[PDB]
Design a protein around this nucleic acid. Sequence first.
RNA 1: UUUUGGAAGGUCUUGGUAGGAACGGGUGGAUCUUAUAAUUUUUGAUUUAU
RNA 2: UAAGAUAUCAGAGGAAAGUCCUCUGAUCAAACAUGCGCUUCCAAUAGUAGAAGGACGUUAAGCAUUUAUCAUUGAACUAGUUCAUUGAAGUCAUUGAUGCAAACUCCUUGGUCACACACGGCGCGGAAGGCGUG
Lengths: 119, 74, 68, 96, 92, 75, 124, 176, 186
Amino acid sequence: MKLVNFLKKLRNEQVTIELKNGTTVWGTLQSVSPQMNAILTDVKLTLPQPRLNKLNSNGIAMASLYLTGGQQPTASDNIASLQYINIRGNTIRQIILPDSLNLDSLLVDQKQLNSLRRS
Amino acid sequence: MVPPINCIFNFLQQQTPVTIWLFEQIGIRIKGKIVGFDEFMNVVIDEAVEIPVEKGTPLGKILLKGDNITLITS
Amino acid sequence: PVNPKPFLKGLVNHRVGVKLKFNSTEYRGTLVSTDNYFNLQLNEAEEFVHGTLGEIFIRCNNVLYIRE
Amino acid sequence: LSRAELEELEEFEFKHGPMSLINDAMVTRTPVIISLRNNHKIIARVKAFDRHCNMVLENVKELWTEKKGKNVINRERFISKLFLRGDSVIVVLKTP
Amino acid sequence: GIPVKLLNEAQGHIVSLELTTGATYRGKLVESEDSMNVQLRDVIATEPQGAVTHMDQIFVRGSQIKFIVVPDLLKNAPLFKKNSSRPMPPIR
Amino acid sequence: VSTPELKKYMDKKILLNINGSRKVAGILRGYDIFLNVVLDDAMEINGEDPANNHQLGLQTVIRGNSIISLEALDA
Amino acid sequence: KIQVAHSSRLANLIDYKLRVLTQDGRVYIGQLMAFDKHMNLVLNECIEERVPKTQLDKLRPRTLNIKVEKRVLGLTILRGEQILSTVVEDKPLLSKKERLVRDKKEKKQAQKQTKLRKEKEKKP
Amino acid sequence: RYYCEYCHSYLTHDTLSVRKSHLVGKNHLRITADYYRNKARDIINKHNHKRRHIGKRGRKERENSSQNETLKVTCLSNKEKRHIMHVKKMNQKELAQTSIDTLKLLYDGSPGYSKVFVDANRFDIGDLVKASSRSRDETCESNPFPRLNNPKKLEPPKILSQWSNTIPKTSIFYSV
Amino acid sequence: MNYNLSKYPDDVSRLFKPRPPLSYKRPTDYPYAKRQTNPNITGVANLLSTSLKHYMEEFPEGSPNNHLQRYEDIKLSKIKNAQLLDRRLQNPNVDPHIKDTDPYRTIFIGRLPYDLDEIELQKYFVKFGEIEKIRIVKDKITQKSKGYAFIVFKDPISSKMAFKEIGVHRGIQIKDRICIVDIERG
RNA sequence: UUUUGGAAGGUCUUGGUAGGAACGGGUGGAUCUUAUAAUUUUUGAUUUAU
RNA sequence: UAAGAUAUCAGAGGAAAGUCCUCUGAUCAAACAUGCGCUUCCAAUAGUAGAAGGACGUUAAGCAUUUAUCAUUGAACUAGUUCAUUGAAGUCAUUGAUGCAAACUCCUUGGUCACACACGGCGCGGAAGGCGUG
């Protein structure tokens, strides 16, 4: 079994990939690779504010957010919108998938059934 | 030539006490006799002691994982 | 003359401590079984970094050493 | 080995091995606690798992605490359905 | 894979490196293997806090390379031809 | 897959950097496909040349997941 | 700015001036030319762009101007381990129609070489 | 299988060493030497044929340029331009291979000339050139007085052919 | 360049001119020694297991794993497959249709054309000794010829010589199909 | 009388205009699955944290 | 490095279980065509312009800041400071580096198209997508 073969069927869905850095990426998903290289479209990648009376946020990710060339100058809070972001798999920590879709239709892997039906 | 897996084996049979420097993050050096090893350079240490970097407690018989092995030294 | 893979087989259902690399945290309980990759499973464990825990699974990467 | 031989091996290690804790937690509808290497813990129910220890979860409640000069706060974030990458986890306990 | 096959195309020309520790080596590249590890000859080595020295011979684990800068005339070597017509192979 | 070709290096004195800061100089005996390396008469170099420098052991073997560079300070 | 094809993978967008991010927060912006199984890539005329430590207080949440210190390095071969994501910047110098034209003339010219080589190898 | 796409040929017996015998083979070296010599000139010889954008000229500038007289242009013949491009291409080859090394010629009998200009035996480069006579042992005991019918006069300064008739015709003093 | 330790001659080696040395830029990420993932991972506490009850009362009944019932549908269907096979194995000394003379005299013939007859079967098999009986077997549920028959010879040596000849000979062609022969098996 | 489909003629518009089909190979390259979660890329030592 | 494979699903058929193979549906993909009052963009000459991107260009030693080794021994000294000697390492820079801002110059790009100087479309293209049929 590969549970990455579950993600491949989750195509054209709204999703939030949430990265190792702490950068969340709200967008429309396209073809996920076998190594989990998720590739999105109409995206909005942001950093949350850890409040706690001005605790300094992720110093590396703020640089990488501005560098994408998506951060608009009058973005007061720390966000950056753009089209098309290709994301290397290993960086994914979580993927917050939406409420509407039913798991029971999608978690039935075809190669799982095709091993038992063949025997 | 003297391959390393060959030369790890010449601490097993010779019964020499070794010191093993770990990954710099953790902050301890382990020492004691290397009994036996696997293909993945993870070893069992007999009569082991945990020195922070000479007041550290004795461990006993410890299987050490091969991600954290930096040096193995006599 | 004991190798590592047979060493885990000897330590089946005995009281072991397993040290994660992070905050000098040993998990103190009775081992259940082992994997090919030294994934672990515990019963009646105790977390020493104080608490008494139920039934634990530990992933392989995170472990430093295994003691009896 | 053959392709059919590994299918037997995978069914064993999920059923009679360390990952049997997760597999017996999926079937019996028992909630788990997971600790990621993020240093924040999620209290959830498993719906699938896999070789790499990644897993699809349901009714996730994350619990993340942060500190800055000995000033603590305990934040709680609720999620309906989540897909967790498997390298992040270090310890999975199964609740009584 | 072309990224690696290019590095063999650059033997005996001056290249740069940038190890993930943040150093910068730049000398003539003598050897390379399929895991992107290299032996440089007659190099100039720039430590991450700017300190520069010269060393005759150096080996680097390929795993620690962040990028390699190659001479610019290989941009049109024939790895990058899309439509290529190989002849029919000789029979073994 | 392939063995790293340090065939020309062996039996010469060799400085190499372990992880970040530690530098270890010795005489290179043997190597393997992972670049775990073993060397005789090791000595851990530091800022003060005779003072903080101390010898390690008669034979020491280094894991290849902590080699960064490996310069050959001889011919 | 530029609208990329809604289902276009990394194989499609050759010659597109990309904007690749590494783990350290440094960005290499150049024309892509190859890629690989584990996603290491060859840019053609790339420029590394870094936000210096002094400027970084300015990006903390309150028109902002950031002094981005950049250095040219033509024709790199990056490594996969380091890449964090990619984003598209410009589109290639040649058209979509013109990239088909240059293919068919090169596909024709490549075939002519083999037949002129095979008959020069056959008789002599 | 494996093949070398500079030569366009497949290897007959695939091993690692047969590759290395082809990779440093005399035939293959002459190809890859010649392949990059062609790509070198082709970026220069195929000069950027720029695309023009013609603006509709003004009423004002069309009257100010009409009163200004039309200048004569000069077009050479086809036979003429085939020769003048043969010359100008051969001239730029010369400016590649000038390498003005008068300064090496000046310090010939000096006391460290063996150690700095011979360049088989420097320190920086010296170890690298021995792999791929006038030795370093030379001191200032041999040839004590340079001028003992040994030295050659300094070769005079070069001059442009095109403008070879701008030179003053007579010297100021009578040379031998 | 001066030396050029390369395969190429001096002109071609000077042709690959490298861009000048990289400008130095003071680094912004963390130094390689200091690099580490988050340490001080506070374990699954007793206080955490005390705050489980706020989660447990909220979601006391877990959602039903209906994707598992697709697997419990198939695996239980395979066990029911064995029970229908178990209904058949209890039912050959009974069948009446296989209960004439000695089973050492009986040839099995199989793969016979659906559209054979017992007279063409008799012709071919009478090639290897006098016949005591035939029967083609037909589906008792509706009389499709099953493609097998049982043929009792007056001697078991003629039954084993018929076996020899007309099965290991690729399968005896009768009408247009390649007919295995065996001994009775059953 | 209308809708749906098929055949022909007329008119507008747009593309192509020298290669195409079958068949054959101990043929090339792409992708996919598994060996492969065990130091050299993708199953975590870069949110600087006690 | 090797082995295997070349869309998935469902139904009918040929050699109780499964495999192999064939035509019929659904879904998926690619290429090619071809449409949408589909979306966005395509620069003065009735003028000496201007838009996007640069400059690893100048003004400019701008202006405003902060930086230039450690150990050992003696003298004086307040109750730290200077001078001289001995050892250790030592990117270059202080016209620097770091922060702030402007002006000027120069480089690459394009339909610099056709019709009109006329009180919230339905000119002929090209470029970039989205969407739909075949």
